[model samples]
Target: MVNAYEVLKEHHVVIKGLGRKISEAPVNSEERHALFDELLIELDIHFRIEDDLYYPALSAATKLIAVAHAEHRQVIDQLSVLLRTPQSEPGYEDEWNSFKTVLEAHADEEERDMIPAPPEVKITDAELEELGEKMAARMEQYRGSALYKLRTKGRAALVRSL
Candidate 1:
């Protein structure tokens, strides 16, 4: 399996991508909604692996991870706020703004503080492989969803046309 840190690093950029999409597009564009759903699916499993495995095994109390953890907890709850925001309501933009703000900060801290200075989550390849397996199982459920599949297809088609 790929190194867990790199996988997470890649996912961090993806999180940013989701934020950029929503920030730039209409509040209810097809592309933005697709990206939003994909973000939920990815963040759901990514944070789960962090909560279920990565945090306990890694730098739980460390500055960067702690910040990321708290932000994750905050962002997860805020995700629901978007649901309550109807198209007619400007609250959709407000909620999305708030959601992306913490998400961006979480990504920044993870990259700067956690990635370079692994204060001790000195995770072994074997351990990372195990985590990957766990994440793969989580992705199994996520990938099976119609929303995930739609997001994937749309992305691929978008690339092909370019």
Candidate 2:
């Protein structure tokens, strides 16, 4: 069976890489918007998996998981506004940076918090593998969803016009 933890870890890498990409460039209106679209979709899936599948299973093992959920909500709330607005709007870049910072920090904290916990409550190797498969499947579904395609394509178009 696949390891869920490994899948989760892979997501962390993707998120961190995206964050770095955003940080490396001067906030171009088009690029930022596209990246934001990508980021939001990935975040949605990550949070859903955690809240729906992982958190309940592991929450009993550590308070850290709960804390992570709270943080996710906060980040989501902050990012949601930017997602709706024009990427070129004043203050959007700052808001995006702040949101990314919080998310990256939360990811770091989660990694630290789970390291000490045993695989039993946190998630077994087999469960990790299973979750990994589920995650991949979920991502595909997400990509096909109207919201995902609209957001990504819209953002890309917005960027192209700039």
Candidate 3:
């Protein structure tokens, strides 16, 4: 059965991978542009699903998407700015560094603050399967897209920064 933790952690895994990739190389390089776009699109979808499905369940079940929601908003805002910023622009490195740091810390905090999900939200194996299926279907739509293929291919075309 798919529990809440199981579902939530899948996206977190991807999020962490992107974070690791960015952290592994220098900042503000043009070669990673497609990754930047890839990251943006992938993130937008996960966030939308979480914001709509996971957060509401957590919020309804517990009422404090508080810090989690706020932190996510900050990351989203930081990412939005990056989309408009020219590659290797002055201070781009600093901005990316700042956001990456916060993004990682935010994930850490999210895990540290985990609480038991409401029974109805996480208990029933059938419900869990249904929720997981819905999420999977939502994510599957992207599997054939060019961006998804890029991700699948590890985006070797998008070399590491610096």
Candidate 4:
């Protein structure tokens, strides 16, 4: 079984990887597309897990998680719009920067909040493993969706200019 922290830390790895990719030479089309696809799938699973499992449990335990959820929605909405547009569209860069900023902020807040869960609501290793499995399954199921493909293409095009 995996712990919640482990799942989150793994997510941080992906986020960091994306940041590195963007920073280092602005990935090629194929590479950017692949990474973008991975990011979308990863984020989809992440948000679902938080909304379905983590947030509910945490919200019941404290008010902080609820506040974080609202913030999460804001970030998600912004990303979704950028993802839907053509990568070559005007202002795409601005949108991507805004998305990145909001996402990083959200991740920081979640990391801080989860670090000190109350004893009663603290997630067990088995629970974390279960959650990870569920998240993985969801990603697999949505991996080939048309929207995912479109977003990935847009991301690839956008990154080519970076």
Top candidate by lDDT: 2
Report model 3's TM-score to 2 decimal places.
0.70
lDDT of 4 by residue, 1-162 (tens): 655566667777787677557535343356665666666655665676677666665655567776787887877778777666545567666767778788888888877776445555867667767766765565455444434545666644432321
- For candidate 3, lDDT tens digit of each residue in 68-157? 788887886676565555556786776777777777787667666643454444445676677667776666564344355456655433
The C-alpha TM-scores of every prediction are 0.69, 0.73, 0.70, 0.68
Q: Against the hidden true structure, what lDDT does model 4 obtain? A: 0.64
Candidate 4 ranges beyond 4 A from true positions: 23-28, 118-162
Q: What alpha-carbon RMSD in Å does predicted model 4 have with respect to the real structure?
A: 5.7
State the lDDT at 11 in candidate 2.
Answer: 85
Judge candidate 1 at residue 84 and give its lDDT. 74
Clashing pairs in 4: none
Which has the higher TM-score value, candidate number 2 or candidate number 4? 2
Pitting candidate 2 against candidate 4, the one with the higher lDDT is 2
Worst 10 residues of 3 by lDDT: 153-162
Clashes of each: 0, 7, 0, 0
User: Predicted candidate 1: what Cα RMSD to the true structure?
Assistant: 7.3
Per-candidate RMSD, Å: 7.3, 5.2, 6.2, 5.7
Clashes of 4: 0
The per-model lDDT (C-alpha) reads 0.65, 0.66, 0.62, 0.64
RMSD, candidate 2, Å: 5.2
